[PDB]
Amino acid sequence: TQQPIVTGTSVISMKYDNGVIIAADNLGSYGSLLRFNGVERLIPVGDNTVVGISGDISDMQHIERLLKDLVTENAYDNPLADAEEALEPSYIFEYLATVMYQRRSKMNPLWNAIIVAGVQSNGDQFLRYVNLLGVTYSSPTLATGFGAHMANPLLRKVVDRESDIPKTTVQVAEEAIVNAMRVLYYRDARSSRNFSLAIIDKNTGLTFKKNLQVENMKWDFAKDIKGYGTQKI
């Protein structure tokens, strides 16, 4: 049993007709201190998978190392490592899920909330969540922590059920996610304005965007607000 020290906030994601999109800001908080700002919480594995991690950062770095090893190991005595026998998003997820549950069962968890986003070899979109309890689930949209309360409601307005996926384009999807990131910056006291976003399309492959920023924010109305009730000036 432990307690998280340096932490990453929300990880939001959703699937569209040809793939999945996932994003996470670049902050590493230390309690209420917004300590680190160049933290990448989106971990690409191969070119068909991206693992988004929230929670304890030291554990995240540990999962990072685990992931690099999987790649190395899978390459050993594997002549089809970059083909039929390359790592699938579902393999990467089942692995992590396995680890997460074993660690909670030993009463020594990896204090994280993880979302694995990717495209299977047959083109199917893959989006599943696993956390420090070993709990797992899938949904057209998935968000961790804070984004579960504020991002899912927005993303679900785009893809409310399975039949909505084929009707959603990368543009609409990326738009929804980018807007969600802005909302999270408005109400989440542990968020950052900078973030990374990744897209895994069954055609265009993996697109990884770094150094994005929340833009087009509305703050002007703040000038018209004074006092907390009766004050006039």
Partner: protein, 244 residues
Amino acid sequence: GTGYDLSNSVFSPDGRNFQVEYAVKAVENGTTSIGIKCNDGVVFAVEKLITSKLLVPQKNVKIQVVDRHIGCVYSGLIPDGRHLVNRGREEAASFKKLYKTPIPIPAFADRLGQYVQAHTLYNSVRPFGVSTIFGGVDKNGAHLYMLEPSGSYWGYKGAATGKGRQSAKAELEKLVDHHPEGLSAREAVKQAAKIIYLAHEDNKEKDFELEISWCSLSETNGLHKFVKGDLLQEAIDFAQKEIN
């Protein structure tokens, strides 16, 4: 008296370890394999005897990668070779895990060395029945190595072991003389394909399959990769041509 060659860690009156020497015989009885160090990397090649038409071509790969920047090939008892590579792999993972940086070739060589030497210390184990040629690229250059069943190893410009080691060594020595400035990864691949064809005369009875791999700072980014398709065929020809 006698019987000094029955137990593994026993010194004979002349100070030798006969079991290690007998292990060497198993190595000499194996397929020929080589390694060539080029100006910015290393190339590995091996002879794959085609026992019959039934062997699916290109499927039974013999060259093995360690971590992501090291290649290993060996002659002798194949299983022993795999055993040594599995260890090398744990050895490499351990090093990276602790020091973050991938294991340097010299460091890696000694890891394999101490392990192999370890198997000549007790009569409860048998020495390794293989000689291993391995190497790769690291923080400061390319490195080639050959490890004997005694645990002995040194850095090489070129190396060979197995049935046709003499032919190969002969060819390798020529290259060394005619190229004091250094061969290129591209050239070494061809040169390697040739040496193997030539050295195949000491086993000209059975048909064979060629296998090559390389690790070049400029050609593979310092990562170990297998020579396939066009580059492979081009090398096959270069050899088939100079074999006449």
